[PDB]
Each structure stands twice: as C-alpha cells, then as structure tokens.
Amino acid sequence: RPEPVQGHLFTYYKDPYCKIPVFMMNMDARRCVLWVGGQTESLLSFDYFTNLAEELQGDWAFVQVEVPSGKIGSGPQDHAHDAEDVDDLIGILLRDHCMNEVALFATSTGTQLVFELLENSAHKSSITRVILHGVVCDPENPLFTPEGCAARKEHVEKLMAEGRGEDSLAMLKHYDIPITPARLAGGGFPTLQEAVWNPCIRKEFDVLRRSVGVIKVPLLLMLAHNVQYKPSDEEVGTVLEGVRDHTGCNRVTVSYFNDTCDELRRVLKAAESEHVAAILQFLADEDEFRTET
C-alpha cells in the first residue's frame, strides 16, 4: 500500500453549490497527464498512480479530478455536462498552471467524457494525447446484445421519466459497472465496450467514426478482461484493424494487460508494472514521432 503522496489541492466552482477538487503532482513540468475516472472512482483510485506520477516526474505532471457526477447531488449531471466541467479545468491548467499540453487519461466510464470532449472541446490543440483504459466482455453477453442495448435504452428513458436519474441502483440489471441513468441517458459511449470492442467485432464502422474517429491525436488503448473471457486471436486482429483504420490519427497503440477483474467489468488489481511501462513508453515514443521534423 502506497505512502501518502505530496501535491497541491484546489477546487474550481461548477455552479456555486458544487466545488470540484483537483489534485496536482509535479507541476515543475511544462505539461500534464490529466486523469478522469468512473463515478465510483476516487482520487488515487489506482495505487500505481503514485508510482506513475513519480516516474513521470521531470517530464509530465500528474493531475486528477473527481468527476462531478460521481458525487451525490450533482444535478444529476450527464456525460456532456461532466465533459464541459473537465474542459473548463483543462482551460484553467493551460492558462493558470503553465501547462503547454495535456494527455487525457481516462479509466472506466471516464472514457465517455473523453470521447465527448475530443469532438467539442475549446482546447483541442492542447490535448495532444489520449490514453483510455477499459475492461471488455463478450458482445454476446446479454447486456450488449441488440436486445440488451434496446432494453437498457428504454429502461433508462423510463427512469429519467420518473425523475430517478441519480439512482445507480435502479440500473443494476441493465448494466454492469456502476453508473447513473442520467449518465446513460445523454448518449455517447460509456466505456470501451461501446466505443471500441462491440463496434469492431460487429464491424459497426459508422459507430467507430463517432468514437475513435473524433480522436485526431495519438491514442493508447489499454484493454483488460476477466479471466473467463478469452478473446479470439481473430477478434484481437479485428479490433486492432478496426481501431487503426477508423481513428482520426494513424498513431494508435492497442495493448492488453493482465489486470484482475470481477465479472462486472471492474478492475480489482491492476497489472502495476505493465500499466506504468506502457504509459511512459507511449508518451516517449510519440515524443520521438513528433520531433521527427
């Protein structure tokens, strides 16, 4: 278990009954990795973040924000309004905190905010990289079957109709990762399951245009799954090709990690060393492909 890590804490105002805390490490750098996560993820959600930040020390800063919609009484806020809040932070970092570029790093349902931001951000030229982590399952899982997707859409529309958009427990048979109906109701792509895995295996190319297509800068996908699910080599090839051919940058990396996951697509224990090495090397390799000039 990590020792307490030093850094700087501030909040910025959403409305004036909602302050959003931001924890910044190693700001002596001229640029930052900005992490946003799932609704049930906390600052330092992954213990390896302390190691990540420290390895990045001198090269990249490490900044963490807690998603407003992870908190009781946020609205309840959808993915577009949370993305809006993260965009205002990105602006604060660029303008007030000497950051020249940002690598967006999203885990779990944080990846929904990133796709939303990448097509609508006021700061697109400053978001130079994207890192996305996700736990994937079989598309034939009843959750992600055509019927499963339709029943969830309907269920969410009814919950919103009853004014029950903040009750993640009302969502427990129609989805796996904890999520509010309100985050589901706005659209977009909750996780890499909807953004990458399902559309690549089913060859849904117009869906992929809406997701990875909007990413016009280097992309790292970090994929995990519960031991039970054994993606075919074919499926791994289809996903690699589907992502490369349809991302808006040609520089995509797709890596697989030995994270321990439950049967509901949450990481219990990350492959510590693997995550840190894949991130350091992705940032350093894209540092080389750019300085090619």
Next chain:
Amino acid sequence: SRPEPVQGHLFTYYKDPYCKIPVFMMNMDARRCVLWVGGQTESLLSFDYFTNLAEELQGDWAFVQVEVPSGKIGSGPQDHAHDAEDVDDLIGILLRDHCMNEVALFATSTGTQLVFELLENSAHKSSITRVILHGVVCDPENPLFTPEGCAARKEHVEKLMAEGRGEDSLAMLKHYDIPITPARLAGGGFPTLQEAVWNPCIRKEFDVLRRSVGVIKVPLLLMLAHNVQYKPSDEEVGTVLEGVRDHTGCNRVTVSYFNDTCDELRRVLKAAESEHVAAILQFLADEDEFRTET
C-alpha cells in the same frame, strides 16, 4: 477572489475492495489534528477558508479532510452508522500511523450526524479531545420540522428504502432541505444540528439531548448560522444555551452565532470566514489553557 492551491499529502484507505476513501492531510509536523467531515455534497476544501484555517493552525494542529463515502455514487448506499465506522477507522489510522496524539473532530452540515454516532461508539474516544460542529438552523415550526413533517419524512424514507431507492437523494427534495440520501436518513441518529440541538432545545425535549450532546464528553464548540429572515428571540437563544449547558456530557461547551450568508434550504452560501477561523482558533487555544490548569 479565491485560494491558491494548497500543499498537503493525499492517501486512500480501503473501505472495501471497490471503494477507497481519499484523505488529504496538511501540516502533519504537528502532533495532533483537526479532522473534518462534511455533508454528502461537500467536497474536499468545501470552504475556501479551510486554507486560511489550516495555515493559522500550522505548527499547532494538523488539518485533515476526508470525503464521506456515502457522498459518492455506488457507496451501498451507506447509512450513518457505517459512514461513522469508516471515519473511526481513519481516526485509528491517524493515531497509530501519523503520530497524532489527539483529534479535534470538526463536522459541517450532515457530517454532524456521523460525529454523534462516532462519539457514542468510537474505539478511540480517549483520543477525541474536542468537538466542533457547524449547522444552519431554521424555525422549528417550519413545515419540515413540525411533528407532522417529521412523521411524513420518516414515512417517506421507509417507503423509498423498501423500493431499494436508498441512494436517490432527489427523491428527498420535498421532505428535506439539505441534500441527503434516504439511506442516510433511514438509520436514524441526528442528520444536522436542527435535530440534534435546535429543535429539542426550543421544544424542551431534554431526553433527546442525552442521545445527542449528552454523548459528547469533551469540550464542544457549536457554530450556529441561519438565513437573515429567521430572527431567533433572546428567549430562544437563552433556552438553547441553557439546554446545551445542562445536557452536554461535559460542562465546557461554547455556543457561537455566525453571520454566514445562508439560503432558505439551510445551505451556507458564504461563511463569515474571519469569524469561523477566529472562533475555532480561540476555542482550541482556550481549551488548551483550561487543561493546563493544573
């Protein structure tokens, strides 16, 4: 005008292998700490003045902040006894792992619910040497706090809990003012100083006070605010002072009023920043003096 980023140390402790609880510590060179817990919608550094507080305390008390687990989606949803328990686990960690020799517990908003529960059941009661509680109060005859509105809210919560709607704070909007989950109301206790102090003192319900301020066996600062439209009489202020003094489990209780700007839903819009800092510092200082004799 708002605070620069503040330096401190961040860690998390496991509540369970899915929820980790962040804790932000400042100025741990001291050998004791003020520990803050708040309402479910209150974030780390909820009050801008906490930066100034921690600064003024530096060298004397550390300043530690935890986010209430039930403030997060996916918490259970957790009632007040379990939140309290999680806070008690942090107190234990601070005592053994961070050379904290005493803890001043500081709660704002519905965080106060946890403090009363803590103080009666803590494994660490000997190390909790001061309590500071802040609340916004309204007229008890407000339709939320009349005998009937209490019964109506009590019933409404029972109904939601039976539906499995314990996490749905939006379902509580007509039956309570401050944002709160049904699950937090359902376990009982005293959500805020309205229920713990104001209502029972004005209504001379002194048995209730034994369960609230009666469990507090160390010096207590009560920090009271109200919206400008509420004008408590001298008599009612007197009855509240009398009730707290006669029924707290320790004679060293201070009851102070603050010129906080509050809306009509018992939320602080702007703390009287200088008043809060000064009252907290003077309370901590005066109680050190009292204890040193002899």
